[PDB]
Design a protein around this ligand. Structure first.
Ligand SMILES: CS(=O)(=O)c1ccc(C(=O)C2C(=O)CCCC2=O)c(Cl)c1
Ligand SMILES: CS(=O)(=O)c1ccc(C(=O)C2C(=O)CCCC2=O)c(Cl)c1
Ligand SMILES: [Co+2]
Lengths: 371, 369
């Protein structure tokens, strides 16, 4: 009858919000133009040959506060002209050859990235890139998160050496909600990240998985981590094979109206955008009526059925969510579109949870639908 | 007042059509999806995990008879399951790391690919992939064209291992591939190399570059080759530096109505499609009404101006063309859309040439104005 949650607000440095996601590409242009059309994100900044960067090509797409950065190495034929200082062709080519299209870097704003970096390394973080001040403006540092993903710190006083790009595109995507990594072993990954960050544990209510969510003090930076359960097979085990180890599994994208967004995105799956996981049976939506009846009107339940949208509830609020098919060649990274309703006071982070209860709700309605 | 062409029809094996182009990618899925929307090409066939292929991902777009194959290597941890028998992980990753996104293979239908291959290698051709017969249906061979591009021979009796994709659908008028142009450091050697093993003849010409066009007996397979002229800097040199050697410069796509195609493609430039080269000044389109006004109505002139379409003439016919910006990160491969008008007798290949004349016409319209 009552679910109680604790939060020791034990961040070791001041953390603000997600800043950007950096994908490592083979060709940044075609990936950036695919994502731009498929998600309704505007071309906003660039650092390439047209701006003087002869080391790497990097395009920034934005949608409200969401920033997707796409970076590809040029031919080596030194690094002075590069704008992102942690970059080198060897690590890029290795990453791509080993994992294919995927997230290299999850970037969080912090108060002081040099502060954030030294506290992290003192508490166990494996450094990947030390603090660099770019043009006495922004400071950027990087530490290993899991596998080949880096956590990147960004602090201020898009980036120096980027040029801005001038009715544009917008399907309602407003911000990144959470970024989820797949690891072989929850326990050590958790003690390692929680060890250097001080992020606390967020709460709960076959799956093939064990999950735990790491959260900053205000629970606005959310980092869930999944482990495969051995012994139908775990998609997470499947992820680890095709991704050649740990790596980022999915990004959830918060929308201000998931119906508009889903309408826009489903218009474009067959003309260059993203395809979606097959939708629940009709029994799943008959059961919505009185499981969230008090939050969704009957017209919005008809809307979820037309769009294949999943709904979940926890102690605080309600979550509307839908999962995209893998973004590239391998069955590795995919995207989630979500809208959280409730928990207003501003809206609190994790309002509605992460959809864990939809495993049963999907299985229940699939076995209901046969009979 | 008269231009005379010769054609020794000296092909050494029977050649039919441009069959497909194969791009080698980092990620086949995004490139193919981008090309699909920008060009109006249907997802036609595929060979990948969902088909059992654990070696490479390969997607086929088609528009009319034009076929674009996009191929990328999967992880080697997971080669009999591959459907393209010339594929190996190492070569692909070296290619992409050396050249970026680009064309790996120009494929032509030949009567018999093992015959075509054996005659080529005796007459100088460097082999890359020996004849392989697939499921007793199609034979496949590759010799070296220039740089890391191979000329690929296909003969029959899309490919075994490909599953068809069901699709309302996408179509902007692209109907076939017209020519495919390589950039090399030294025209002469490459010409004698390629012409030596094909028997292809020189199709004749009615700056920054020297070019010659090798054609098949019926001149339906057309392969121009560019050389940089040294000492404004040669865009062919710029190509050679950024692609790290010889490689394919552009593919010209024949459209059955370039006006239709361009309205479709320019609408999509800012929403994922392709952008175009800056268009000529207005004097270019004023000097058109007295240069091609016997072929295009005044309303078609106004249509070329609205779309930045270039027009040239030659002895037999008239060519409508326009060029795209570079397709990937590097300023290397780009696309051209063309429509040939004239030369009916079916239409003869190369009716109108290749746009040699527009260098002069673009300069002089710019000195005017
Ligand atoms: C197969 S499903 O029931 O529709 C479902 C639900 C939540 C999710 C995820 O967003 C959550 C969550 O985003 C964090 C990690 C634990 C999960 O499973 C996923 Cl990937 C799939
Ligand atoms: C600079 S332009 O007048 O727009 C022009 C014309 C022809 C072409 C080419 O299609 C032809 C032709 O495709 C190959 C032989 C040499 C050329 O220049 C190009 Cl890339 C540009
Ligand atoms: Co051309």
């Amino acid at each position: 009858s009552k679910f109680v949650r604790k939060n020791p607000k034990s961040d070791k440095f001041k953390v603000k919000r997600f800043h950007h996601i950096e994908f490592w590409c083979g060709d940044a242009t075609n990936v950036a133009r695919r994502f731009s059309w498929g998600l309704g994100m505007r071309f906003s900044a660039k650092s390439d040959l047209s701006t003087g960067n002869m080391v790497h090509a990097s395009y920034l797409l934005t949608s409200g506060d969401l920033r997707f950065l796409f970076t590809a190495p040029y031919s080596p034929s030194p690094t002075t002209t590069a704008s992102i200082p942690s970059f080198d062709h060897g690590s890029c080519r290795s990453f791509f050859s080993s994992h294919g299209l995927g997230v290299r870097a999850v970037a969080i704003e912090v108060e002081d990235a040099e502060s954030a970096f030294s506290i992290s390394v003192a508490n166990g973080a494996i450094p990947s890139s030390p603090p660099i001040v770019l043009n006495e403006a922004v400071t950027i540092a990087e530490v290993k998160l899991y596998g080949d993903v880096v956590l990147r710190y960004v602090s201020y006083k898009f980036l120096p050496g980027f040029e801005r790009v001038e009715f544009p595109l917008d399907y309602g995507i407003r911000r990144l909600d959470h970024a989820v990594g797949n690891v072989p072993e929850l326990g050590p990954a958790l003690t390692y990240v929680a060890g250097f960050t001080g992020f606390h544990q967020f709460a709960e209510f076959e799956s093939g998985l064990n999950s735990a969510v790491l959260a900053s003090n205000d629970e606005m930076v959310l980092l869930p981590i999944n482990e495969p359960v051995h012994g139908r097979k775990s998609q997470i085990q499947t992820y680890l094979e095709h991704n050649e180890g740990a790596g980022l599994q999915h990004l959830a994208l918060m929308s201000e109206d998931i119906f508009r967004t889903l309408r826009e995105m489903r218009k474009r799956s067959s003309i260059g955008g993203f395809d979606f996981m097959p939708s629940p049976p009709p029994t799943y939506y008959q059961n919505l009526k009185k499981r969230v009846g008090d939050v969704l009107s009957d017209d919005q339940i008809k809307e979820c059925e037309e769009l294949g949208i999943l709904v979940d509830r926890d102690d605080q609020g309600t979550l509307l969510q839908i999962f995209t098919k893998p973004l590239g060649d391998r069955p590795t990274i995919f995207i989630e579109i979500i809208q959280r309703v409730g928990c207003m006071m501003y809206q609190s982070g994790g309002c509605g949870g992460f959809g864990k209860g939809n495993f049963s709700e999907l299985f229940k309605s699939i076995e209901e639908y046969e009979k």
